[PDB]
Amino acid sequence: MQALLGARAKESLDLRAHLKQVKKEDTEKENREVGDWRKNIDALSGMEGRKKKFES
Amino acid sequence: LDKYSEALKDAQEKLELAEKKATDAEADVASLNRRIQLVEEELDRAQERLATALQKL
Numbered sequence A: 001m002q003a004l005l006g007a008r009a010k011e012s013l014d015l016r017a018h019l020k021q022v023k024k025e026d027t028e029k030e031n032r033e034v035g036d037w038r039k040n041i042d043a044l045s046g047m048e049g050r051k052k053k054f055e056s
Numbered sequence B: 001l002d003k004y005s006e007a008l009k010d011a012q013e014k015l016e017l018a019e020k021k022a023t024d025a026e027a028d029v030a031s032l033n034r035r036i037q038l039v040e041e042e043l044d045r046a047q048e049r050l051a052t053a054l055q056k057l
Helices: A003-029 B002-056
Strands: none
């Protein structure tokens, strides 16, 4: 009896997991190449005197 | 007079340099406080977002 319902469930999960894998493949393939920068501030610390430019 | 004037140009130059050191050190007290608050804010936010992530967990 249950062959048709089994096949229907199988095809449903197959298509869903298919779309899912189409996503997760290139998801995991590139998941560290997507980093960012540090954004540090100088805080005017590395100068031991007056600047050479006109602003100081 | 030359000795006081010179002692002064030197106390005054050392002062401009000490004041500069203070200005720059202060520029950095402030740049550090900005970074500290930016990082403390990112930390508090990381912790707010953590508490949220944990709540969402």
